[PDB]
Design a protein around this ligand. Structure first.
Ligand SMILES: *[C@@H](O)[C@@H](C[C@H](O)[C@H](O)CO)NC(C)=O
Ligand SMILES: *[C@@H](O)[C@@H](C[C@H](O)[C@H](O)CO)NC(C)=O
Lengths: 334, 334
């Protein structure tokens, strides 16, 4: 595979591509003005050293911030309304905090906490303005727990991990389907309108497993509580041995790649290095010659569909995180 | 005056210089192997986007970590023994946390908090192996408060601010001297052996005032409590109007520059922009063409004495922080 330096080089070229096209108000170059086009922008650009561009995204995000600490608009994609509303808020919180925008991160994180279910520790899938039944999903919960870790709200993160453990233990038929959603009481939801990963098919949505694995590994690093490492380990084993090969190939495999790279640094287990290396190389090989990522776009374009802009920022982050955990893991274990 | 982009470009040249000379275990190229040569390295290199190099510093720091969460050795400079012991620990905590090394940041910050005076909110000036009288100083307290902000221990940060307010109110002769130390009871220490800035002379040590100003501004950003903004602006106006011109010229003026840049973004007051621009430009002007900063050396050296290496990482950080707060302040206020 490719070396940590090569993975980082790919991330930097994509970051440069984004910053060259950033708008004067700080928005990233999306064909639609929606928060789901740039929610990873602060954190990704900061990791690439583009701190003025990252702070410009913070300025743009601050201009959207409502008195309750939410960014309810502009939102268009249904997954950011009633599947995992808080997916945007979680990365916004992390990016703001690492930038030292402590007022923005406090306000964002305090809103995120209002959508926690205090009975289960899960985080509600649908936003305040979106009618729903109080269901909570693995992605809202994992990203909110990760934002809790970055902002030092470790008890909130521990509670999120409790929910993930209940969701995992409660699976009715895990060898065929991962039901990523629970009802407001914590029972796993199997209705057709609830996210379900067909683990024996090559149809994506693997990040509903991979993001929990990454969060739980970071929580273990923060706490040294082996219960969290055990659950992250079980989820990685699930993806590696019970899931279709698409789990480490689909566009959403970066989350599992990052979890694997962190688990390698913490445990030294070579399978984790192999998983992270393979995913990092795959993402590197799919990069356009210009710097962005897209499964369809092939030209020298000035902007991107929101999903490709999000993917481009996401892969800046995943390649950086994989690269630094592989490099330090090699120093520690090899 | 240099533009925010130019300040950042200077930081990046220095960061490249450091990374090119980094040692295989992650230590930075110091002529002596001491923690005071590299304590700002994790945070500085991360801000520059050199996350693998920053993680390598974290690996080195982790290998020195003792069971109590301290790094008592290697230390040689007396200021890092009995004047502001925790100055090293504070930057290590911040750099570890921003990298997501949550076990490292938890352990470092927990040790820092064992040195807090629960009656005054100050942090003890002398480390565990160093005898002393329990005195607490403004630099130990402000960097520990900033580390508390980054790790989410906001009550600790508020207590640190209380100590700084008491120190400021209790000054017996602020026109001539800033007494930066209080005894274990919280009373300002005026004895011959306690750090004191000669504010009407050009003799340095201005960061005993400038770092509190930076920390208090960050705490105001985190809480919106105008009491902290008022104290921060008291300190800035003190340095601007009552202190020697050296306060904005000495090698330690970068802390005040960062405080001014943040105050400009938060308040729009043009004088703060002027102070930050002036300090940023002065630091850029002093940079070696080869990328480092040094009090005495010029030309293409392979390494630096610890104080110059510390100053080089420090100015990566300050130029980056000044640049991004000036850039965002211009966006917000114009
Ligand atoms: C994980 O972030 C996954 C998110 C979804 O694709 C978003 O809803 C659209 O960007 N990312 C990828 C690249 O699959
Ligand atoms: C503030 O960090 C100041 C610290 C003192 O110089 C240290 O005691 C020695 O590095 N930095 C500078 C550049 O003045």
């Amino acid at each position: 595979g490719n070396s940590p330096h090569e993975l980082k080089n790919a991330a930097q070229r994509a970051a440069d591509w984004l910053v060259e096209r950033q708008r004067p108000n700080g928005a990233l170059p999306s064909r639609t003005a929606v928060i789901e086009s740039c929610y990873k922008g602060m954190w990704a650009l900061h990791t690439a050293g583009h701190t003025q561009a990252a702070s410009a995204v913070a300025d743009y995000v601050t201009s959207l911030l409502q008195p309750d600490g939410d960014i309810p608009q502009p939102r268009e994609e249904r997954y950011f309304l009633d599947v995992h509303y808080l997916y945007a808020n979680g990365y916004l919180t992390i990016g703001a905090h690492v930038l030292g925008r402590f007022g923005l991160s406090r306000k964002l994180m305090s809103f995120v906490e209002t959508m926690r279910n205090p009975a289960t520790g899960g985080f509600r899938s649908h936003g305040p303005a979106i009618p729903g039944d109080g269901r909570c999903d693995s992605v809202s919960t994992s990203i909110s727990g990760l934002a809790a870790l970055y902002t030092g709200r470790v008890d909130t993160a521990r509670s999120a991990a409790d929910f993930l453990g209940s969701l995992w233990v409660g699976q009715p038929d895990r060898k065929n389907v991962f039901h990523a959603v629970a009802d407001a009481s914590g029972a796993v939801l199997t209705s057709d309108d609830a996210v379900a990963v067909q683990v024996r098919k090559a149809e994506g949505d693997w990040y509903f497993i991979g993001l929990p694995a990454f969060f739980l590994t970071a929580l273990y690093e923060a706490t040294e509580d082996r219960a969290y490492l055990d659950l992250a380990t079980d989820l990685m084993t699930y993806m590696d041995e019970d899931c279709d090969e698409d789990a480490f190939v689909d566009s959403s495999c970066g989350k599992a790649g990052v979890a694997a790279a962190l688990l390698y640094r913490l445990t030294g287990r070579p399978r984790y290095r192999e998983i992270a290396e393979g995913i990092g190389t795959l993402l590197c090989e799919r990069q356009s010659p210009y710097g962005y990522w897209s499964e369809e776009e092939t030209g020298d374009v000035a902007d991107l569909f929101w999903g490709d802009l999000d993917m481009t920022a996401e892969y800046v982050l995943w390649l950086d995180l994989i690269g630094r955990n592989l490099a330090s893991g090699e120093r520690v274990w090899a």
